[PDB]
Design a protein around this ligand. Structure first.
Ligand SMILES: [Zn+2]
Ligand SMILES: [Zn+2]
Lengths: 71, 132, 394, 179, 66, 125, 99
């Protein structure tokens, strides 16, 4: 029960869940499961990448800008 | 899977390169400028010998010795083995015919600016010239 | 990483699928084929999930994939009753994975994901986790295989020794260190230290056993120019030194009379000396039914090259020179193991087939498959550092 | 001291590959196979050596070396990790495809100029912003992995310019340059 | 890990200057003018900002929670 | 009208030699199957030229990124050999002194099953 | 709960300069004050309470050091602030300090 309802991805768990989702996609010979998995994976990726850029929005963002222009 | 998905996405990509181009993975570092739209039988040449079948190292403006390439097959058992040369008199010229070097031939698709048209002209069999 | 990847992709397979089918009263076949390896896991008594390297580190686990194979249990008996029941994906053992390899969970994986796994993006990889210890395989250097060398061990009956560490390609047979050497001193005699023979034999007697009755015919293999009497008069002393043996058969007797197990009957001896000259010596050239004509060429080459060194026409080989060396990376180090570890399990399934047919009952391979051979051998050698079996670890 | 050692920065150790396309290729040149050869035709002919195996005889060794290297640059029949060594003094061509050979990348020289023209630097400076990479220098035949055993035969420069200028002659036959 | 509070040599406070220094590298400055514009005269204090490697930015990627 | 218009592509980017036609196209094909279908739903072409001298080849929103690198082992003439004349009427065009160097890629997947089983049986009596 | 140690925080706090002019020639040395712990006659009390709740990273600066004395502050009066730590989403720092 307790794994079901609460928002799953943040902080580290999304990486293992992404791997698991990939494994679920790969283990299926059915194209419908594959495409549903693909969709699910893309969505969680986007969500996660947003969350990462959000956290890095400040003070990480600033250093990213100086490093790209220094090289 | 399903056929309707395929006909849709193919005929759509015969238009999704014909839209306006303005952003890319390599933007803002670069932006696009202009467009080059898209059987065959190519006679390969040896870089040492430097083959006379088509004069790539000299680029002739007109044939000094012929009206057109009368390049039929080298035998009736040998249709892919074309004569590969720009000759029209019965003269004992030296121009190298296309030998059946399939072993190395491998893949090589060719296309052209066919008046800005959607087509293809992929190569059939990569035959090769020789000092014969 | 590359070394490992080639081991996982192209030496795990090709060590499995190299071994012979086992038989045993009716008898069976029992053949292996395709091999399967999954991402690493820990709970395949909990619910199944991927093991992450950092969890493997923190819990003193062993970062390993389960390993499976396709086995055909094939068997036939009286009445032409036969069957080939296949056990797809039978578990064999657990194989430790090199971090950031082609078969790691940490592969093609972004900085975001590496951080989310609590793992370093800067970590190079290339090491094993064994009981939550990071282990590296140090690249052991060695003299290059299949490549003739010449040296002066002057501290012996030999003025010069030619050498070849002949090897086939990761065979269940190890390398055979052949030597072909020139004695000090008639004077000037030349001998092959062939493998498993009690002692060295004059080279001409080798070519006689190879099947060259004629004198003219042996030297064409060893002396390319018949026009320089320089090299002619050099082999005479050995050519004189074999005039008693002229046919193949008496020749075989001569080598066969010096095996580690010399056969009591004459034909036993010939049966020996025919086998060593086809499988033992110079494997890399071929181990087939008729390869003597090409085994002849390469041996004449070794003699030829010794004659060149002795004439002084060619400079002696340097054993220190790094072109004469190779490096056992994490691929070859492991392939060396996995050979022996797979042989052990074929010894297990053997005795297990036997104890079971003798009852006249039927035998089952699932219990025959001792998982603890691979899983523990690997895990052992990668742990102690001892490159061997635990009982011969000294 | 001296027994435990360390790799160099650009050292690469050969992962290994099968000598089978080489065998197939070498067959269909003007080779002569070992089992169909008259023992009288080994005198004036070069000996071929695949992975330590004397597999063939060739009457022309200046056509092979030029052909084998062109493939080993053009990434097709002979993979980049292979080393081909030509011994001049003794008539021997040795090829290794096996594993464990330590080698390192060098720039190729032709005439007395580098294959690394300013096009490659321009494509390689603009990497990440386009898909180009080190493997394109390999595939374009600009840089080459040379084994220690093949480094025996190179005539190697130490800077592009300074060693390939015009003076009293040192060699004027450079084959490679250091990176 | 994180910019020192003081130049180890002299003792000038450099702890407040790291954000500002990266800000002056968001501007198109040479590091030599960035260091000068912040007022670091000594070649002791100037080493602190040149040489500081900011690893706290990498340690911050290892979230505890969320 | 004549220029460098030869284009090598990898196995997974094999474009049809003929225009798309509904009378020439059929449904035969199906992570495993994901790479399968791509062969004909994608692979008419527009090689876009860029201000840096790079090229991008488009068969969708997916991109192949390309450089006009030189060639020296393949110095042929390109020609439209159509079966009409004596034995394939090769029409002259560009010479193969250059051909595309470019990037087109793929991926893999993951697995998981079980280790050993139970044991320690005991017969009656 | 920061990414640094415990003493790293404490060490960095030590090196922050405090405005001393009006007060330093009034205070007892700690070792000379009669108090069983600390006195306003022998110390100034400081306080840091920081929790990163937001999404962006938290620059723990000398701004966060809250003094009980209005004069013995970090150098903020009249130009950035001494960076102590950087906090992530859910990390915190509570301490009290004496000067
Ligand atoms: Zn200073
Ligand atoms: Zn007090």
């Amino acid at each position: 029960e307790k794994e079901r309802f609460r928002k799953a991805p943040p902080n580290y768990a999304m990486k293992k869940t992404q791997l698991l989702k990939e494994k679920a996609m790969a283990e299926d010979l059915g194209d419908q499961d594959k495409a549903k998995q693909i969709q699910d994976q893309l969505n969680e990726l986007e969500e996660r990448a947003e969350a990462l850029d959000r956290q890095r929005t400040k003070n990480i963002s600033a250093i990213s800008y100086i490093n790209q222009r220094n090289r | 899977k399903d056929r309707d998905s395929q006909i849709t996405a193919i005929e759509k990509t015969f238009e999704d390169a014909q839209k306006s181009i303005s952003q890319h993975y390599s933007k803002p570092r670069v932006t696009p400028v202009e467009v080059m739209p898209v059987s065959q039988a190519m006679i390969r040449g040896m870089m040492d010998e430097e083959g006379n079948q088509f004069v790539a190292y000299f680029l002739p403006v007109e044939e000094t010795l012929k009206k057109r390439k009368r390049d039929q097959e080298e035998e009736m058992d040998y249709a892919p083995d074309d004569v590969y040369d720009y000759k029209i008199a019965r003269e004992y010229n030296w121009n190298v015919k296309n030998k059946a070097s399939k072993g190395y031939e491998e893949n090589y698709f060719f296309i052209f600016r066919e008046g800005d048209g959607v087509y293809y002209n992929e190569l059939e069999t990569r035959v090769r010239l020789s000092k014969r | 990483l590359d070394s490992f990847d080639e081991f996982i992709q192209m030496s795990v397979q090709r060590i499995v699928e190299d071994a012979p089918p086992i038989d045993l009263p009716p008898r069976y076949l029992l053949k292996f084929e395709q091999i399967y390896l999954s991402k690493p896991t820990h709970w395949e008594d909990g619910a199944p999930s991927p093991m992450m390297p950092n969890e493997a580190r923190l819990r003193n686990l062993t970062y390993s994939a389960p390993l499976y194979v396709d086995i055909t249990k094939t068997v036939i008996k009286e009445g032409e009753e036969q069957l080939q029941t296949q056990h797809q994906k039978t578990f064999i053992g657990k194989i430790p994975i090199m971090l950031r390899s082609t078969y790691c969970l940490l592969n093609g994986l972004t900085d975001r994901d590496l951080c989310e796994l609590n793992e370093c993006p800067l970590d190079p990889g290339g090491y094993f986790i064994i009981n939550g210890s990071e282990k590296v395989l140090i690249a052991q250097e060695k003299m290059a295989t299949n490549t003739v060398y010449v040296f002066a061990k002057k501290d012996s009956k030999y003025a010069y020794t030619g050498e070849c560490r002949s090897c086939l390609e990761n065979s269940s047979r190890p390398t055979s260190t052949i030597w072909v050497s020139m004695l000090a001193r008639i004077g000037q005699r030349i001998v092959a230290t062939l493998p498993y023979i009690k002692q060295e034999v004059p080279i001409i007697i080798v070519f006689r056993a190879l099947g060259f009755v004629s004198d003219r015919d042996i030297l064409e293999h060893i002396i390319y120019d018949f026009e320089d009497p320089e090299m002619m008069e050099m082999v005479k002393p050995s050519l004189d030194e074999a005039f008693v043996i002229q046919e193949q058969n008496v020749a075989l007797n001569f080598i066969g009379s010096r095996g580690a197990k010399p056969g009591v009957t004459k034909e036993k001896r010939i049966k020996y000396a025919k086998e060593v000259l086809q499988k033992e010596m110079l494997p890399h050239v071929g181990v087939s039914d008729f390869c003597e004509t090409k085994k002849a060429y390469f041996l004449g080459y070794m003699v030829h090259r010794l004659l060149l060194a002795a004439l002084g026409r060619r400079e002696l080989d340097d054993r220190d020179h790094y072109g004469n060396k190779r490096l056992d990376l994490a691929g070859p180090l492991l392939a060396f193991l996995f050979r022996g570890m797979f042989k052990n399990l074929l010894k297990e399934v053997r005795i297990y087939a036997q104890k079971f047919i003798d009852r006249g009952k039927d035998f089952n391979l699932e219990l025959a498959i001792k998982t603890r051979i691979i899983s523990d051998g690997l895990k052992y050698s990668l742990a102690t550092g001892n490159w061997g079996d635990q009982k011969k670890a000294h | 001291v001296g027994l435990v050692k360390n790799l160099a920065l650009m050292a690469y150790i050969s992962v290994g590959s099968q000598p089978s396309p080489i065998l197939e290729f070498l067959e269909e040149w003007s080779m002569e196979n070992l089992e169909e050869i008259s023992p009288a035709a080994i005198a004036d002919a070069t000996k071929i050596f695949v992975n330590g195996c004397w597999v063939g005889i060739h009457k022309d060794p200046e056509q092979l070396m030029n052909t084998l290297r062109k493939l080993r640059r053009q990434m097709d029949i002979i993979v980049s990790e292979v080393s081909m060594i030509r011994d001049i003094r003794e008539r021997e061509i040795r090829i290794y495809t096996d594993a464990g050979r330590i080698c390192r990348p060098l720039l190729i020289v032709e005439k007395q100029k580098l294959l690394l023209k300013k096009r490659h630097i321009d494509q390689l400076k603009e990497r990440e912003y386009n898909n180009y990479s080190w493997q394109d220098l390999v595939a374009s035949g600009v840089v080459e992995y040379i084994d220690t055993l093949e480094e025996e035969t190179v005539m190697l420069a130490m800077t592009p310019d300074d060693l390939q200028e015009k003076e009293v002659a040192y060699c004027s036959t450079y084959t490679h340059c250091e990176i | 890990m994180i910019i020192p509070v003081r130049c180890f040599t002299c003792g000038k406070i450099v702890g407040n200057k790291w954000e500002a220094y990266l800000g002056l590298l968001q501007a198109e400055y040479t590091e030599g003018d960035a260091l000068d514009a912040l007022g670091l005269k000594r070649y002791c204090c100037r080493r602190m900002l040149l040489a500081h490697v900011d690893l706290i930015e990498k340690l911050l990627n290892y979230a505890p929670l969320e | 009208g004549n220029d460098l218009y030869f284009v090598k592509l990898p196995n997974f980017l094999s474009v049809e030699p003929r225009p798309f036609d509904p009378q020439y196209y059929e449904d035969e094909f199906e992570e495993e199957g994901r790479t399968r279908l791509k062969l004909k739903v994608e692979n008419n072409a527009r090689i876009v030229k860029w201000s840096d001298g790079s090229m991008s080849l488009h068969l969708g929103n997916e991109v192949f990124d390309v450089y006009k690198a030189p060639l020296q082992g393949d110095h042929n003439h390109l020609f439209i050999r159509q079966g009409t004349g004596l034995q394939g009427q090769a029409v002259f065009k560009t010479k193969l002194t250059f051909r595309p160097h470019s990037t087109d890629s793929a991926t893999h997947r993951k697995m998981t099953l079980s280790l050993a089983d139970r044991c320690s049986k005991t017969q009656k009596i | 709960s920061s990414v640094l140690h415990d003493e790293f925080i404490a060490h960095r706090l030590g090196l922050i300069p405090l405005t001393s002019d009006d007060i330093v020639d009034k205070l007892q040395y700690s070792r000379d004050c009669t108090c069983e712990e600390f006195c306003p006659e022998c110390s100034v009390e400081f306080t840091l309470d920081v929790r990163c709740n937001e999404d962006q990273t938290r620059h723990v600066t000398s701004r966060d050091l809250i003094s009980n004395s209005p004069r013995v502050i970090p150098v903020t009066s009249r130009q950035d602030d001494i960076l102590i730590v950087k906090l992530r989403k859910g990390q915190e720092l509570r301490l009290r300090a004496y000067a």
